[PDB]
Design the sequence.
């Protein structure tokens, strides 16, 4: 999704990550530019799976008012690295999805990277259990992002205004 | 997981494979020796996924009457190759799973292979919608297995006796 | 390293591809935009490998006259699909490299693709044993490139002018 | 190519591994049972690659005195992990090859593991720059292997007798 030079960094993930506590609704707060989000008001809904991992339901509002959504399935392929997921969205090739940091109740810092020779395509995201996230939490997560080569300057803020998104 | 010489054959899969028709209950009729089937009366149940692919519930009876079962998730990582799945069983590393041939309402030939240098570990299985499958059908699928270098003689026949399996 | 929408296409590869005839010097005639070519006069030289596959030496001229180069190794990881190689350059992650069409003594259409969810990163190339290639030959390879969704308008022409590259 | 239960362990590899100091001739001293060594007197010879990584030439003596050898190519696909190699032996699928420990001048502990569902296939070997290695060094390396579940009882000692190998 977003090309930067160098090979993919390998940042720390959430230690002892617990997926059952990660389920539910997360709101997109900030994110690296990508090719899949085409609007605003983005939310992810993660739910229990009857097999392994969990189901994914992403949803956003387009500027012309059209609502768009996708379904996918998330799986930790190595049970010993539960924070290192892979998402299989409908009609999409698999993408990595690592949870760098989360407190389950408020925020989460998500990272994703795929190698491209001497370059890489990266995606990063700050999400929240609410349409807003406190300013301090955001600055902290931006802080870790800098350590693995994401520029805070390059981030897009997602519109989560209550009126516009209903 | 059966070690044989040579690299994994790359047999053909079922053309224009339709997972919705592959769902439901399958009985293990014959199978390559493996490390996971520990008894008899083996069935697989495939169900809808709210994400992609489908949910898996494999189940067998032990000699002492104890029922053993596992849950997992099946996903075709390349949507243009829907018959070439990957199974993510709980407590297992991901494994390949090809539907080489199926008519959906009667039989299916499942193959799975993993390379080990100049050797490979293979798993193959004939399943049926009924606890039995006609011998001529069994013979035909055995033909297919031989055509890509599996020995029919090494196949194990699975117990599906209504008396024993009830 | 060029983003286009959709998953990677799988165009046909060169039949009975013979790497021994593909060795030697190729001149870049035109190619998709990428992050590795920074100048002109780009050439690829393919050489004997004492193990498997063959050796790679890429070379171009910078605008200030500085020559830049990389070495790498090409390996056909599956001997039965010899046209589907993996290229391992110094300081780079592995990249696919398919020889889609070549007559060995004149031209070659090179392709490479890596998936990015519902998008993909592509690189495509028309190379030649001479610094120029006939207009009729280029158009044919353009017909093929068009067939998997690269537009001739998106292509860059490589400077192979004898004076300037000298 | 030796099947054990559980997923592949992830042992530490030699820190700051230098492939350049690893070149030349190593003798097989002890090894896990595998499918490729058919005799004795086995040596691996590693040499410069004109591309990336290094060149591979393995050879052993068969019981009937006939000598057999293979060539391949070794590559660290992740340059930041030079001890984590991939070996491409001729006509074989790629295999992992980790250097867990080496002092370059005397010994080396090589490990390799490929997952097979809830089981795995492993290969490990203690090599030496001489046909023999001191018992204390061997014991030390056997110690390391034990910590990740290879049985010292399962190890085979390789015949490197000077006369028999002459
Ligand atoms: C997404 C896929 C992808 C591919 C395929 C790819 C090829 C590739 N070409 C490279 C160097 C190079 N490659 C070329 C040119 C060629 N390269 C060719 O495959 C051919 C046919 C030519 C034509 C001669 C040149 C000239 C260099 C060196 C340029 C320089 O470093 O200044 C490198 C080394 C890394 C770098 O210098 O940044 C890679 C990885 N990179 C990718 O990200
Ligand atoms: C390079 C890596 C990479 C990733 C990680 C990735 C995720 C991804 N997000 C998607 C949809 C979506 N994704 C989101 C939003 C999110 N998505 C998230 O992973 C998170 C955390 C949010 C935050 C809420 C939304 C709203 C959609 C639906 C978009 C639409 O239909 O327009 C899709 C589906 C494909 C599509 O319809 O275009 C993919 C593959 N794609 C990639 O190429
Ligand atoms: C599951 C992982 C796995 C590994 C790692 C592996 C290594 C491996 N060793 C091979 C040959 C060989 N390998 C060796 C010896 C060695 N090989 C070594 O990795 C080392 C350290 C030595 C020590 C000297 C020899 C002597 C041969 C040649 C066998 C012959 O031709 O008789 C081959 C070629 C296949 C063949 O033709 O038989 C492979 C794939 N195979 C696997 O399945
Ligand atoms: C290298 C290849 C390879 C494959 C394919 C594989 C499948 C596989 N089958 C499993 C359980 C199982 N698998 C089955 C039966 C089936 N399974 C089928 O794919 C089909 C068609 C049936 C027939 C109905 C059953 C009944 C179980 C549960 C067994 C138990 O509880 O012990 C498991 C779970 C973990 C384990 O017990 O090892 C795996 C990984 N394992 C491998 O190593
Ligand atoms: C907005 O855009 C989408 C895709 O471009 C389109 O399908 C949809 O109909 C548009 N909504 C309108 C015009 O209401
Ligand atoms: C049946 O078998 C398994 C092991 O084979 C054992 O764990 C289980 O307790 C047994 N149950 C009995 C004795 O019914
Ligand atoms: C050529 O230009 C590149 C641009 O970065 C630079 O790396 C290099 O120093 C230049 N060579 C010179 C100054 O001769
Ligand atoms: C020795 O035995 C091997 C098989 O065991 C055989 O292939 C080889 O040719 C034999 N060597 C000779 C010439 O006796």
Sequence:
């Amino acid at each position: 999704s977003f090309i930067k030079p160098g090979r993919c960094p390998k940042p720390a993930v959430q230690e002892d990550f617990d997926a059952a506590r990660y389920l539910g609704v997360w709101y997109d707060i900030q994110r690296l530019p990508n090719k899949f989000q085409k609007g605003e008001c983005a939310t992810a809904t993660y739910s229990l799976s009857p097999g392994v991992g969990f189901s994914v339901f992403n949803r956003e509002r387009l500027a012309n008012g059209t609502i768009k959504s996708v379904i996918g399935s998330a799986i930790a392929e190595d049970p010993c690295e539960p924070a290192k997921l892979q998402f299989f969205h409908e009609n999409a090739a698999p993408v990595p999805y690592w949870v760098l940091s989360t407190d389950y109740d408020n925020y989460a810092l998500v990272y994703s990277c795929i190698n491209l020779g001497a370059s890489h395509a990266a995606y990063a995201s700050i999400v929240s259990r609410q349409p807003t996230l406190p300013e301090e939490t955001i600055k902290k997560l931006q802080g870790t992002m800098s350590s693995f080569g994401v520029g805070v300057d390059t981030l897009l803020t997602t519109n989560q205004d209550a009126a516009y998104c209903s």
